[PDB]
Design a protein around this ligand. Sequence first.
Ligand SMILES: N[C@@H](CCC(=O)N[C@@H](CSN=O)C(=O)NCC(=O)[O-])C(=O)[O-]
Ligand SMILES: N[C@@H](CCC(=O)N[C@@H](CSN=O)C(=O)NCC(=O)[O-])C(=O)[O-]
Ligand SMILES: [Ca+2]
Lengths: 210, 209
Amino acid sequence: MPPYTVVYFPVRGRCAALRMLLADQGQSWKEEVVTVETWQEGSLKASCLYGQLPKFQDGDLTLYQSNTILRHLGRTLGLYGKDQQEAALVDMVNDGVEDLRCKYISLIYTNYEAGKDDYVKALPGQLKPFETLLSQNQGGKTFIVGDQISFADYNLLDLLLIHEVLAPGCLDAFPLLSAYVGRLSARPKLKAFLASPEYVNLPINGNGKQ
Amino acid sequence: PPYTVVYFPVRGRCAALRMLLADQGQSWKEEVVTVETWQEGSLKASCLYGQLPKFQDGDLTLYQSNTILRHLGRTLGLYGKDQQEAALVDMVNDGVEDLRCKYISLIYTNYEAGKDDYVKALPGQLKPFETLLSQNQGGKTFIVGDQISFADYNLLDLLLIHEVLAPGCLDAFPLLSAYVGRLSARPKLKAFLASPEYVNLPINGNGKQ
Ligand SMILES: N[C@@H](CCC(=O)N[C@@H](CSN=O)C(=O)NCC(=O)[O-])C(=O)[O-]
Ligand SMILES: N[C@@H](CCC(=O)N[C@@H](CSN=O)C(=O)NCC(=O)[O-])C(=O)[O-]
Ligand SMILES: [Ca+2]
């Protein structure tokens, strides 16, 4: 059996980035799907540390919190910068990605109809920091931090992909981020994963909105 | 080092990192940002995500409170003994961050009408931390492993501000209760928590708590 197990609802959501990471790094993992019906049962939810998913297993290590899973995999697979200084920059990027993801999730699940217009208008200002970071790192020709891929790249990549769906052409204003999405998405293992049913046949979110 | 904390005159998202620096015997400077300065626009525009705190470690400039905590945890050896513990430390910190976000939402956007439901839901929000303690050396040491981590400081702050919001919220949790008393008694931290540097700052920026 695989050493890694992802326990989550049948959506990309907060597991999209970690899955891209696993696939691109040639890692093996199992998908344990939890249906909304099974979740309503209460048993599993009550057993979850913070009463939520994703839940992740690495051998007998049981983790919760999507960013905890990303950092754990980043640590173990060498995707956390070349030194302590870079590790901090990677965290700074991931925390920024998380802040915007939280806003994105809030829109999708609690106020889509009445908040989309404002969200899209504010989007450029929210994406600009990442374009700025790319511009300050090798002209944005490599990764978000340093000269090697990090877990933050996978999280940012997902953030960009879902926003292109939410607001088509949103990266027209950000040449480096646009090229970055195309470049990372072309990586052999990641490219195959992104085109596979395992990824394509899952909705981005669980409420039919995107 | 040297360390510089750039923030508004409140405890807020710098409380935990300050407790960490003080408890670890580190020296740092406080750059207090005024309303005029922030409204002026220049400083804000220069911040990566347009927000504070901003942190200086020598020639390294950081933003994001949890990035600062993890950086100090990494460089000062407050991140568990190995990868397994580091993951648990992250799990705790992310849990603390989630509740802090809910707390922030309450304080700044729905205090009057939302306090009732928030306090009613609080016990269920704190229980996970009691459970974590119960599974680590009977809760007699730290939140993860046998050494203090950056998550301990963040959790400690979370618990302190909730005791203000809802007095007695830890009475049902013996491990958390003893944990707060134990951590708060650490010499350097005790002195810091009793100093006006800490005491004379409001918890939040809108006078609510
Ligand atoms: N800070 C946590 C959040 C986990 C979370 O919000 N999980 C949701 C599904 S993903 N939603 O955007 C969840 O488990 N919802 C069910 C419930 O809350 O009962 C994380 O894993 O990043
Ligand atoms: N995710 C960030 C949030 C930083 C933040 O919210 N900063 C606020 C002050 S603390 N508020 O609860 C801030 O800089 N507000 C001024 C503004 O946003 O113009 C962090 O540092 O954790
Ligand atoms: Ca240590």
